[PDB]
């Protein structure tokens with residue numbers, strides 16, 4: 001029974017993704033099992049004038065799928081296969097495959113991986129389309145740097161749906177559709193059924209073991225914690241400055257430090273502690289000494305000795321450690337905002353962070369600003385080659401608040417909005433590209449970047465996410481979704497006519 | 498070929514271990530088997546060469562059964578991870594490599610049903626079902642083995658050939674005895690399970706239980722600061738009395754599950770998680786009745802937080818699922834409780850959880866709700882022989898430093914021995930305790946230094962099921978190919 005309507009025991013679960021702020025009201029949720037099922041659902045919906053959306057992993061930070069207008073959901077749960085497609089010479093990942101399944105299959109069967117996200121529950125469907133990256137991206141780039149081809153169901157001007165395959169081959173007639181899938185974002189062009197991935201290096205023999213990167217066999221994992229109790233602004237500032245300068249220096253595509261990843265968590269002082277998690281390739285005989293060099297750089301002159309715990313773990317095991325994977329808790333309510341950083345925070349922004357993290361004004365105790373190591377081999381790719389236009393940044397910066405009370409959304413949304421606006425005040429409240437920031441990342445969507453009350457930079461949401469990729473995305477949208485069947489706040493949208 | 502992993506392979510460091518970092522295996526080969534015939538070939542070759550084998554499905558074994566340095570060949574079931582409805586057999590097929598998270602997501606999203614198996618999503622079906630798996634839905638629906646209709650098993654015969662058999666719940670099935678041993682007999686004992694088939698003993702959405710559509714989940718936390726021994730005792734007694742009264746198979750409270758964590762006082766707080774079917778209009782009032790009973794007269798006001806969630810989402814909330822952290826190192830011990838702790842035992846717990854003679858924030862005694870519909874099944878109908886208990890009690894210590902095992906193992910050994918001191922330091926069946934659960938294995942139950950009860954490890958885990966398990970063992974693994982500490986073994990000859 002592949003349709004799910006209100007009253008079905010499965011409806012409460014399947015009307016929602018993993019973000020509990022958003023409750024969808026679809027008349028039907030179809031657990032589709034093939035391209036031909038997809039074309040059937042889509043043609044019927046479009047002929048009937050009913051708004052659609054696709055869910056794969058359900059990790060959307062915004063209401064793109066659960067939007068109250070959506071009448072028909074295609075849930076990709078039954079399309080979760082991962083394997084090696086011999087007839088194409090590439091690995092096939094169905095849109096509903098979670099990253100935990102992708103990594104366990106690729107690694108235990110073939111000893112390879114993709115430099116995708118940290119959370120194992122994330123789905124391929126939304127993740128790859130949006131420019132997925134994670135712990136191994138400094139070493140191996142974005143997951144879209146391995147996208148060889150995609151199979152997507154698109155809707156004609158007429159309203160009927162059809163299946164097409166689009167590839168990286170420059171002569172492929174649907175090549176621009178392939179390109180839009182290398183960061184163009186979910187819910188914009190059509191329903192991805194499966195992605196085909198392999199290295200784009202030309203010299204490589206046609207063997208699965210050789211067609212995607214080997215991860216390090218073992219890694220060093222460190223946890224470092226500084227108590228907040230003895231920590232003044234000057235100490236907080238030196239720590240952020242140290243960390244920022246180190247990433248400014250050691251993030252180039254040819255840096256030996258491409259094999260290091262870290263997340264520095266600037267937590268609310270109510271939490272008791274600031275913390276950092278670091279992962280280093282443990283292969284080379286000097287790995288421990290190098291890890292200590294980074295850790296000593298971050299703490300240098302801070303005046304607060306951190307607690308530090310380092311363990312060596314075999315690689316696949318390390319991917320499920322919550323220190324890297326996150327804690328798995330998708331209950332409660334969260335608001336995410338984010339930005340690219342080309343350079344580290346200036347002293348005035350650090351002052352804003354310290355005030356906002358120590359203020360008793362609010363008591364958002366779960367609030368955090370996380371600085372995620374980025375760049376390295378991501379930045380070897382020309383900015384125009386894929387739809388991930390940010391190819392010279394050093395960090396992704398994620399601002400988070402979480403809470404429990406369903407009646408208290410406004411105070412929590414306000415806190416994070418004020419914090420982000422204030423950090424980015426001098427560029428109209430938003431991370432404007434091409435300066436200290438490089439705009440925003442579409443898999444951390446934030447409707448506020450299109451809101452005139454929060455964005456006073458004169459730069460539209462579409463340029464913050466996509467920079468100069470946007471006009472090429474709009475040309476793909478005009479060709480491939482002429483009816484604008486696939487849309488949401490922050491969806492690629494052709495120019496007004 | 499790619500499917501055999503040897504030392505030096507990039508995969509070898511991961512695949513030589515389970516999820517238990519205390520145990521590092523030294524297998525010459527790990528075979529990622531893809532079929533019954535591949536398993537047969539691994540086995541028949543190993544038997545001819547005299548090489549010890551072991552199977553790994555989800556890797557969650559709490560003991561060294563799979564990673565024992567003597568194991569030369571491992572069969573890893575990762576590639577056999579499918580879950581679906583088998584139309585030809587009229588039953589749900591769960592391959593041994595399937596994790597519980599995959600089982601639950603597939604059974605629920607595609608068919609609207611579930612199995613009352615364990616809380617952790619990363620556990621494999623392979624070892625879990627064979628050992629008598631239970632979890633949050635067991636008071637409402639029994640043990641997962643109460644839905645075991647059939648099993649496909651690769652066995653080794655006297656001649657040394659491996660072969661594949663199907664054993665079913667039907668009394669006239671010539672392999673029925675083998676089927677029976679899979680309803681609780683434990684992994685690594687009889688042969689290699691390729692797949693289980695499951696359905697209600699009594700159209701796919703009708704063939705297994707439907708879970709509640711929504712549940713209430715509560716977290717209750719009592720600060721340890723100014724919790725004295727009287728208040729700690731009162732809370733434990735209250736909880737114990739409630740479970741002694743409300744754990745019958747016909748109890749309306751078969752739809753409540755909870756874990757009460759008696760933590761080290763260094764941790765800051767005692768805590769309890771509770772899940773209640775939310776479908777009745779009076780669920781919130783029923784939950785409040787339970788919670789007020791546990792806290793009555795304690796003198797410490799808990800912090801309490803209740804949320805209503807859709808069922809599948811609930812199964813991934815770490816308050817129920819656990820935190821997913823299988824790094825560091827852990828020692829588990831466990832017991833069935835037919836009745837709640839007496840005075841001496843509550844006193845021992847309090848002293849050992851507050852002692853500074855010892856220092857480790859991570860030690861806990863978890864009291865897990867049990868019984869209800871588990872107890873509607875006669876004690877001899879499956880290989881799960883404990884069918885009148887009210888709780889499972891789990892003793893745990895965890896640590897980071899791989900050079901500090903002795904002090905942690907000593908701490909937990911001494912706590913468990915002291916709790917069970919009146920019966921030889923072990924939970925002897927048929928009194929306040931009912932023995933032990935083979936999915937929480939503990940080799941100390943076979944060690945004369947820790948078990949002075951006169952009752953052997955086999956009777957603690959299996960009670961009167963053991964002779965029948967030995968007859969199964971003699972018939973189906975005459976060469977004793979499948980063995981480990983605490984494995985089923987025929988009488989001395």
Ligand SMILES: *Cc1cc2c(nc3c(=O)[nH]c(=O)nc-3n2C[C@H](O)[C@H](O)[C@H](O)COP(=O)(O)OP(=O)(O)OC[C@H]2O[C@@H](n3cnc4c(N)ncnc43)[C@H](O)[C@@H]2O)c(*)c1C
Pocket residue numbers: 017018053054055056057058059060061064065076095116117118119121122123124125126127129130131132133134135185186187188190191192193326443444488
């Ligand atoms: C919840 C969560 C998200 C994370 C986590 N960690 C990440 C990391 O380390 N690196 C990252 O780059 N991203 C991380 N993310 C974010 C995820 O990358 C985004 O949340 C993804 O967009 C989520 O993908 P998915 O789980 O599939 O989410 P959905 O909500 O189903 O879809 C998102 C968006 O894309 C559309 N879409 C889904 N499926 C399709 C298909 N098949 N075709 C076209 N479009 C699709 C949806 O309609 C929606 O618009 C860690 C955590 C814990």
Ligand SMILES: *Cc1cc2c(nc3c(=O)[nH]c(=O)nc-3n2C[C@H](O)[C@H](O)[C@H](O)COP(=O)(O)OP(=O)(O)OC[C@H]2O[C@@H](n3cnc4c(N)ncnc43)[C@H](O)[C@@H]2O)c(*)c1C
Pocket residue numbers: 515516551552553554555556557558559562563574593614615616617619620621622623624625627628629630631632633683684685686688689690691819936937981
């Ligand atoms: C780590 C972990 C364990 C849990 C968790 N939660 C549980 C719960 O809520 N209820 C429970 O009933 N049990 C819980 N457990 C314990 C697990 O039930 C046991 O740890 C299982 O035995 C684990 O099974 P599996 O993950 O497959 O572990 P393995 O280490 O691969 O095997 C254990 C044992 O069984 C043999 N074996 C495995 N596979 C087979 C096959 N196919 N055929 C025969 N025998 C097999 C192994 O050789 C070994 O002897 C929550 C968490 C976090």
Ligand SMILES: CC1=C[C@H](O)[C@H]2O[C@]1(C)O[C@H]([C@H](C)/C=C(C)/C=C/C(O)=C1\C(=O)CNC1=O)[C@H]2C
Pocket residue numbers: 019117118119263324325326327329330331332333334336370372398400402444
């Ligand atoms: C390293 C990560 C990369 C991924 O891009 C995501 O994953 C990791 C583990 O961390 C990132 C960020 C710091 C953390 C967030 C948003 C935390 C969210 C959070 O606590 C919750 C929710 O989202 C819902 N309930 C909750 O409690 C997040 C964007």
Ligand SMILES: CC1=C[C@H](O)[C@H]2O[C@]1(C)O[C@H]([C@H](C)/C=C(C)/C=C/C(O)=C1\C(=O)CNC1=O)[C@H]2C
Pocket residue numbers: 615616617756817818819822823824825826827829863865891893895937
């Ligand atoms: C409710 C559960 C039932 C399951 O039967 C198991 O799961 C649940 C969630 O909890 C049980 C128990 C209280 C907790 C344990 C053993 C904790 C283990 C633990 O912290 C660790 C490890 O095992 C390894 N490293 C670690 O840090 C455990 C036996």
Ligand SMILES: [Cl-]
Pocket residue numbers: 033034035036193
């Ligand atoms: Cl298809």
Ligand SMILES: [Cl-]
Pocket residue numbers: 063064065067488489
């Ligand atoms: Cl939207």
Ligand SMILES: [Cl-]
Pocket residue numbers: 561562563565981982
């Ligand atoms: Cl053993």
Ligand SMILES: [Cl-]
Pocket residue numbers: 646666697698
């Ligand atoms: Cl039957």
Ligand SMILES: [Cl-]
Pocket residue numbers: 756757758768769770
């Ligand atoms: Cl708990």
Ligand SMILES: [Mg+2]
Pocket residue numbers: 329402
């Ligand atoms: Mg959280």
Ligand SMILES: [Mg+2]
Pocket residue numbers: 820822895
């Ligand atoms: Mg733990």
